Subunit: 336 residues, 3 copies
Amino acid sequence: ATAAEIAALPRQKVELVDPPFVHAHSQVAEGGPKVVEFTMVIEEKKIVIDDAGTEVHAMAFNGTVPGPLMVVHQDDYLELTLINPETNTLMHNIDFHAATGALGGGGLTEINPGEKTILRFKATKPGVFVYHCAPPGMVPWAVVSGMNGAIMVLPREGLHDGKGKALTYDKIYYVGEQDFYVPRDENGKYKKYEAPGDAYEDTVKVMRTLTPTHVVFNGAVGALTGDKAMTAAVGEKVLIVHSQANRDTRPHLIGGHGDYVWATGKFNTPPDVDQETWFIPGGAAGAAFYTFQQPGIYAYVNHNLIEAFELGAAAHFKVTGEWNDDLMTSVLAPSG
Amino acid sequence: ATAAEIAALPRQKVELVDPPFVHAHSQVAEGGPKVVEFTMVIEEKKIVIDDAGTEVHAMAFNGTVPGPLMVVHQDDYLELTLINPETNTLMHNIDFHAATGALGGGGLTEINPGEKTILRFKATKPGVFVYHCAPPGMVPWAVVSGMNGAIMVLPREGLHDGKGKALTYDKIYYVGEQDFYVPRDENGKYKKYEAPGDAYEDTVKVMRTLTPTHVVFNGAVGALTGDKAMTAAVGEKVLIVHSQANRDTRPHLIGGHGDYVWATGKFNTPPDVDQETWFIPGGAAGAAFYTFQQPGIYAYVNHNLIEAFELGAAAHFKVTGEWNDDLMTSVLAPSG
Amino acid sequence: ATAAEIAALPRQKVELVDPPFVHAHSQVAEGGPKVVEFTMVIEEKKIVIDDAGTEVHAMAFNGTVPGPLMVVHQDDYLELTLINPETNTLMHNIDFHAATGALGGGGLTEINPGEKTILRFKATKPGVFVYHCAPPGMVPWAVVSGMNGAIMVLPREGLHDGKGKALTYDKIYYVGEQDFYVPRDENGKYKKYEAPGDAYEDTVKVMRTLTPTHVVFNGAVGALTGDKAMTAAVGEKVLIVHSQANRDTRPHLIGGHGDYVWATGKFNTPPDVDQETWFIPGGAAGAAFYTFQQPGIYAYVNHNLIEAFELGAAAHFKVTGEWNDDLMTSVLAPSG
Ligand SMILES: [Cl-]
Ligand SMILES: [Cl-]
Ligand SMILES: [Cl-]
Ligand SMILES: [Cu+2]
Ligand SMILES: [Cu+2]
Ligand SMILES: [Cu+2]
Ligand SMILES: [Cu+2]
Ligand SMILES: [Cu+2]
Ligand SMILES: [Cu+2]
């Protein structure tokens, strides 16, 4: 399309919401291509990641880890207004894995504190994709400080299974998984710092061990549990988008499955089916579609169980509805 | 199906056999849906995992690491009587990744020493699936102490390739891969403990490094070698089921291939073909089908070669038959 | 085929070229099945792998890390003359994952210094496959010392997408990724050794941590960046063959995608499409086809960003051509 043709397309301003929730959108595109507008303000802030009060100096898109999920449809244009407040101390930018050219946009969006930029790219490929800050010379540090999220580029006709039958979800959640590398002192205690740059050297040494001290969802151990457990009901169809910008993960819904899983996160690649545990390589997003059939509490984890239960990679789903004895029943309850 | 309909179904009691062998079964289902009955007694026991004599306090289903492979067909019911003898010291349960609800059955099977329980679930999805103990609060420790295995839910019409052609194996083996985390003393020598509880803290510290000290098949370095090597003949079709309940693995048959590999372990997901090395993420089972074409000794390994040859993840196949010089021939033997 | 028919096939000698470049070949097979002859001399040599003068005693097929890409077509035979000069100190051999029997050829090619051997095998399965040295008892050390490469067995009719449409590349590159494990003294300085054998004990200790000190492309940090960046032009179709003989990797083209990716490296397995980041397990090769659409400098990395930017797994592509503002444009450049 020409510059004139793009200029004539309708524009739609979207208001982002904090993960794991996802902003309002329509699965099947309502109309022709549009320029979908988003704005995100970058916030460098301290976040507490465990119950021991361990801190991380987060580099957060929109003030959250992960950054919010942006939803558009194939061949719409995504126009991001990115803002770096004068209150921040570092230059930041953004690389959309969904975009084509200039390092995903990173090369055209480098803004110092007190600056902003507007980047527009055509969402030519359908799927879920990671986005993350990538300042030259400081790439992994930015990413493992939490500056990453994902976007979903839906097919204009919504999702479909491998045979073309439509797959329509009732709810959608976005789980951003983060590997953190927190320095420790000689007594095995996590260190705290008064400035982001103060922890750089120490953090890089831990990063080089390729062994995270924490692996969490939505920025902290137990974040998506209790007041933040995700919800659903028996019979409801749920899409779970999961991203990991720097390290591999293997999601698993304990007590359920991934009925259809686009493990590579790309919708033109047929989804795997009846999955117990799927795999998403570091640097990517994936999506699983599941219809709940049993009520109760479910855990959703990275299935290296040490990472899930020792390091923090576990979330919960509270599901309502009637129990199905045909699917599962306790013939004899635990007894002598 | 109603309670009445299920109660009317025929029942078949199956006797389990120790891995890598698999109990007798039919690839194509004989008759309509059945309630297939299995019984397993849990044994907390000391096992030796290497030639030096390293000991692990194993938590073992049916007394073996991995637990035995249970085989049923899609839409049969798997009814497990699980027994935790009073001689044990910990509470145990079972999570079948093939099951739907109550954390895979984990929430309905918590039995203390001196108790038993009978769980029944409908095997609604075809494929190989991991099962493992998961006591709230000590999940990874239970699993990396060996309390995991797998089941196979065969399609009622047996296996087929991705295009509808029948794939009938002549024999099947179940390779359970286990990552162990054994504490060491200041000399770098593995420690031994009186009771399993004594090793908990030291073991959790090793687990947190995400670096196992041993990665083995059938519970110990070299377990599937020598007089315990697997066997086949030129022309024989073999299905190799492989599971890893906690950590990724990348199986490879040295000297062969994976002709058809359901890398995700799910039979409704078309298998990859002509594989050199496949990948099974932690928390899943996979299966590879191969027709041997050359005689001789083969090694079957996790292809991170350090894990295979330094940590223990290597098995052997002894294969009888005639050498095929068309497929391979030494034109010039090693010479000056 | 009869013995006479095999003997009657044409024999063709091919001159190899050093990675990342690939020797002359045709995508669609020219003529019928042939015995393609290659010769490689093994070189044990000290190489510097980083900007701090760190050394490794490389075990190098044809003198390079990785060894060169050999290209044949399905049902051709690959006949390799392998030479181990008397000036080397170790026994070497070769295991072609593309081959069937005798541990991929390793059991028939064990040559001591001063010996040579000629192995012939029929390339029955299409795809890119790893090859590597595998001396019994020292397999991982040989592989992680750089003695590995890959071959490509093209379908006789060239490559095709999942719908059968032809995929013809304009350029092809081979990126071999190597995990190195270099010993350090108590001060953290990498150690140097007089002879290869001298480093064995110390190196295996580093290998058991499963944590590489360096992860590089083409044998050294920065080998494929700067003036050694790979090249392309907007509109050009490029095939990127990538291998990792011992450890997992997750390739990503920063600013681009993998339009068609045979992630398992096998051409009879349909390629994934529109990939952001693909996954190649240790012990395998994969291939990605992409048509460049934007000019500029691109980075191609292992997307565990710590491995890419701290450990060395980052390459560059320098692409010429006209910028496409439809695909991407800076609506508002970075400004106050
Ligand atoms: Cl940053
Ligand atoms: Cl246990
Ligand atoms: Cl070697
Ligand atoms: Cu940033
Ligand atoms: Cu990236
Ligand atoms: Cu248990
Ligand atoms: Cu599990
Ligand atoms: Cu060698
Ligand atoms: Cu190999």
